[PDB]
Design an enzyme around this catalytic site. Structure first.
Site, PDB file in Angstrom:
ATOM      1  N   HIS A  85      12.658   1.363  22.424  1.00 27.71           N
ATOM      2  CA  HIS A  85      12.551   2.519  21.495  1.00 27.71           C
ATOM      3  C   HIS A  85      13.634   3.533  21.870  1.00 27.71           C
ATOM      4  O   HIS A  85      13.835   3.794  23.057  1.00 27.71           O
ATOM      5  CB  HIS A  85      11.135   3.134  21.498  1.00 27.71           C
ATOM      6  CG  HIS A  85      10.881   4.065  20.348  1.00 27.71           C
ATOM      7  ND1 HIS A  85      11.372   5.370  20.311  1.00 27.71           N
ATOM      8  CD2 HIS A  85      10.209   3.890  19.189  1.00 27.71           C
ATOM      9  CE1 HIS A  85      11.001   5.946  19.188  1.00 27.71           C
ATOM     10  NE2 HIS A  85      10.284   5.062  18.481  1.00 27.71           N
ATOM     11  N   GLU A  94      -2.204   5.331   2.648  1.00 24.50           N
ATOM     12  CA  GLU A  94      -2.150   3.863   2.388  1.00 24.50           C
ATOM     13  C   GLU A  94      -3.542   3.291   2.074  1.00 24.50           C
ATOM     14  O   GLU A  94      -3.645   2.521   1.092  1.00 24.50           O
ATOM     15  CB  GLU A  94      -1.464   3.133   3.541  1.00 24.50           C
ATOM     16  CG  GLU A  94       0.027   3.455   3.641  1.00 24.50           C
ATOM     17  CD  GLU A  94       0.411   4.642   4.522  1.00 24.50           C
ATOM     18  OE1 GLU A  94      -0.490   5.282   5.106  1.00 24.50           O
ATOM     19  OE2 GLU A  94       1.632   4.899   4.651  1.00 24.50           O
ATOM     20  N   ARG A 149       4.020   5.330  19.386  1.00 32.52           N
ATOM     21  CA  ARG A 149       4.292   6.659  19.988  1.00 32.52           C
ATOM     22  C   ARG A 149       3.163   7.017  20.965  1.00 32.52           C
ATOM     23  O   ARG A 149       3.438   7.636  22.023  1.00 32.52           O
ATOM     24  CB  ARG A 149       4.452   7.694  18.876  1.00 32.52           C
ATOM     25  CG  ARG A 149       5.343   8.864  19.255  1.00 32.52           C
ATOM     26  CD  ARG A 149       6.694   8.866  18.556  1.00 32.52           C
ATOM     27  NE  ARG A 149       6.994  10.218  18.101  1.00 32.52           N
ATOM     28  CZ  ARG A 149       7.154  11.277  18.896  1.00 32.52           C
ATOM     29  NH1 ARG A 149       7.068  11.163  20.215  1.00 32.52           N
ATOM     30  NH2 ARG A 149       7.408  12.460  18.359  1.00 32.52           N
ATOM     31  N   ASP A 161       0.835  -1.216   0.000  1.00 31.03           N
ATOM     32  CA  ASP A 161       0.000   0.000   0.000  1.00 31.03           C
ATOM     33  C   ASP A 161       0.861   1.254   0.000  1.00 31.03           C
ATOM     34  O   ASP A 161       0.416   2.247   0.567  1.00 31.03           O
ATOM     35  CB  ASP A 161      -0.939  -0.062   1.184  1.00 31.03           C
ATOM     36  CG  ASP A 161      -0.217  -0.337   2.479  1.00 31.03           C
ATOM     37  OD1 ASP A 161       1.000   0.039   2.575  1.00 31.03           O
ATOM     38  OD2 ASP A 161      -0.873  -0.925   3.376  1.00 31.03           O
ATOM     39  N   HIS A 166       6.811   0.183  20.438  1.00 32.97           N
ATOM     40  CA  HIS A 166       7.372   1.249  19.559  1.00 32.97           C
ATOM     41  C   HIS A 166       6.297   2.296  19.222  1.00 32.97           C
ATOM     42  O   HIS A 166       6.672   3.342  18.679  1.00 32.97           O
ATOM     43  CB  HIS A 166       8.050   0.643  18.313  1.00 32.97           C
ATOM     44  CG  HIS A 166       9.543   0.645  18.384  1.00 32.97           C
ATOM     45  ND1 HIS A 166      10.235  -0.012  19.385  1.00 32.97           N
ATOM     46  CD2 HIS A 166      10.479   1.213  17.585  1.00 32.97           C
ATOM     47  CE1 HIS A 166      11.528   0.168  19.211  1.00 32.97           C
ATOM     48  NE2 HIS A 166      11.705   0.918  18.112  1.00 32.97           N
ATOM     49  N   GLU A 226      -0.330  -8.938  -1.386  1.00 35.23           N
ATOM     50  CA  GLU A 226      -0.859  -8.411  -0.117  1.00 35.23           C
ATOM     51  C   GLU A 226      -2.040  -7.486  -0.444  1.00 35.23           C
ATOM     52  O   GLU A 226      -2.084  -6.380   0.036  1.00 35.23           O
ATOM     53  CB  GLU A 226       0.275  -7.740   0.674  1.00 35.23           C
ATOM     54  CG  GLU A 226      -0.149  -7.435   2.097  1.00 35.23           C
ATOM     55  CD  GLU A 226       0.822  -6.612   2.915  1.00 35.23           C
ATOM     56  OE1 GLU A 226       1.809  -7.202   3.407  1.00 35.23           O
ATOM     57  OE2 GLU A 226       0.594  -5.386   3.030  1.00 35.23           O
TER      58      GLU A 226
END
Lengths: 370, 371
Positions: A232, A126, A201, A90, A199, A112
């Site tokens: 991270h 995307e 945010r 995507d 990871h 995919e």
């Protein structure tokens, strides 16, 4: 003359997911000529898998990339005259390459295919990229039955859809070695290795604090586990993580793992806590139950299959579900036994069969993947 | 501070269907700033409707060249004008490109005449793929008909994004039709039932035309109260068999193809049509004129479903028989003439502007759909 198959991709994740397919295409020189076109320094992964791009466009604003991908691809396509362009996932490149191919009446295959949020603004761009590719694609290589049913909801012709599984699951052959050695694995040697990553945010501060308190308690409670936490880089994670997890004998805080390192940890690991879409997709291939540090997920297939459980971000829930997975051998064997609904490690085989079938070289339609 | 609407069109026919909508947008200066962007590869049409393009990309050609040029041209235009919505029409490459240019700047897209489908990417090429691509970028779908809206729902478009408005083609007669209109051929036809025939499709040019011409001749011999007008395809493969087979008959006038404004001005004077024109099939039923379609099939069910059109083919006997029937018995003529044009009631532009105003929250209530 052969089926001329041109694969087009231009970022690190796309390269890894396409590499096993390219390697599968090269196993049929009788029927297929395999051409590789990069848009883009993705030659690092290409040196691992030993893939030599026949074309390297360089595109070092969305409109500017669109113009530049279209300009670059036109001469590549009229020189190579592929029978089918294969695009992945995507990215803007997936759509632009499909569109360049549409404008030379070259067949398009989408690896995919069928992932949907039905929300234009999330993810952006995307969702729109994969819906546009969806209208240009002649062949839809849907990883899952949920993906294929997204495509049926949009009125795609059934015969154009092949559920192949995901090629992510085909990369472990090229990536996993027995020769493999790591200080962290040596440190974990005698214990159940518990791999954790966070990871995302949006979970910095309060949510992380809650996860860490649950993890500390679990470290304290279990004397036969070793928790590996590739942290991270952000100070907003490193500090609270070091502060709350940094001086426990059964917790090793380390720097983020390379893909190749991550893949090689999987044979040694017992349980995962993550909010990574990648680990959720891969880990079940190795029997590893995954507790997902999230309220929701975009993909349903893992949940419904029982390879994953949503566990959220609140302390009591993370502790309890981690405890349950580490003692109650019934729930562990259940999540561990369930097969990766995302693939077999034989998706590239099925996609190549589907291309061969669509060009009349194979008279039989390959067996889907269920 | 207003809803800034930029309308984008590229070809003569695109301009004619968009002209009424622009004129409708210009009727709401309290709520809407109307902006016009031309992207042509037209100066007659734009004068007839009194429309001033604010922008214009003088496009020079592969599909790829057009594609790169329109994208390059539109980025500056949209960066400056900063419209709230871009309106695009039909199934041209430019409709898709303009929608794509808008999407990249997170500018809302309204698609005029949305939902037409063959579900065959190979006919038409590239129009079916173009309208599907536009279909995924559009925020608002202005479906001409319930059938068009049903195509969009089959594609999982959200129901609230679909408005059935009717087609803006039925909005253009107000601007093109004049009571003051005169024409030699209208005078020649005075006192008679005017039968307007066209035969434009290349596919029928040979023995199907000969079969039709024979059926038309027998109708011209038979009916004393009839005047047949045939604006003939200027190609000698049609104009020759026409002038050979029909050019002697005093109840048939063969003439040159009609300007759009002339054709529209014939409609109030015409009793019956025989055509293979998709145009006449969309338009004529606004004037309650039955259409016999010189084709075995048509792409579009709504006409057949309503009684406005009948498929009659190209075989001599059925063309004759169906032409004779429509000229002989009212009750058949009446059924076809009275049925409401399922493609529009002349108010589509009004419904599109209401839909836009509603989507920007200026009009609180969702406006009512066409039939």
């Amino acid at each position: 003359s052969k089926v001329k198959v041109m694969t087009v991709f231009g970022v690190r994740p796309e390269a890894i997911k396409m590499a096993p397919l390219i390697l599968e295409l090269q196993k049929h020189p009788e029927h297929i000529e395999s051409i590789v076109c990069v848009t883009a320094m993705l030659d690092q992964v290409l040196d691992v898998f030993n893939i030599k791009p026949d074309y390297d466009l360089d595109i070092m604003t969305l409109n500017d990339i669109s113009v530049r991908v279209l300009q670059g691809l036109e001469p590549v396509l009229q020189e190579a005259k592929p029978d089918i362009v294969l695009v992945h996932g995507d990215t803007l490149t997936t759509f632009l390459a499909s569109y360049a191919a549409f404008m030379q009446q070259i067949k398009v295959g989408h690896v995919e295919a069928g992932l949907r949020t039905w929300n234009k603004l999330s993810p952006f761009p995307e969702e729109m990229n994969r819906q546009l590719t969806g209208v240009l694609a002649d062949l839809h290589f849907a990883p899952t039955d949920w993906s294929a049913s997204n495509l049926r909801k949009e009125n795609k012709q059934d015969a154009s859809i092949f559920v192949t599984g995901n090629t992510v699951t085909d990369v472990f052959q090229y990536t996993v070695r027995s020769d493999y050695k790591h200080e962290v694995l040596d440190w974990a040697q005698g214990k159940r290795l518990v791999l954790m990553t966070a990871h995302r945010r949006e979970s910095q501060g309060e949510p992380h604090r809650n996860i860490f308190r649950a993890v500390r308690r679990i470290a304290d409670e279990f004397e036969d586990i070793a928790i590996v936490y590739p942290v991270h880089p952000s100070p907003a994670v490193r500090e609270p993580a070091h502060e709350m997890l940094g001086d426990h004998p059964r917790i090793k805080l380390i720097d983020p793992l390379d893909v190749v390192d991550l893949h090689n940890f999987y044979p040694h690991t017992h349980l995962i806590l993550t909010d990574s879409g990648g680990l959720q997709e891969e880990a079940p291939s190795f029997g590893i139950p995954v507790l997902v540090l999230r309220e929701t997920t975009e993909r349903p297939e893992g949940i419904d299959a029982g390879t994953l459980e949503l566990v959220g971000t609140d302390e009591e829930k993370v502790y309890a579900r981690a405890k349950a997975l580490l003692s109650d051998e019934t729930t562990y064997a259940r999540m561990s036994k369930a097969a990766n609904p995302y693939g077999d490690g034989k998706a590239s085989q099925r996609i190549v069969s589907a291309i061969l079938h669509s060009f009349g070289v194979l008279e039989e339609r390959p067996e889907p993947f269920h």
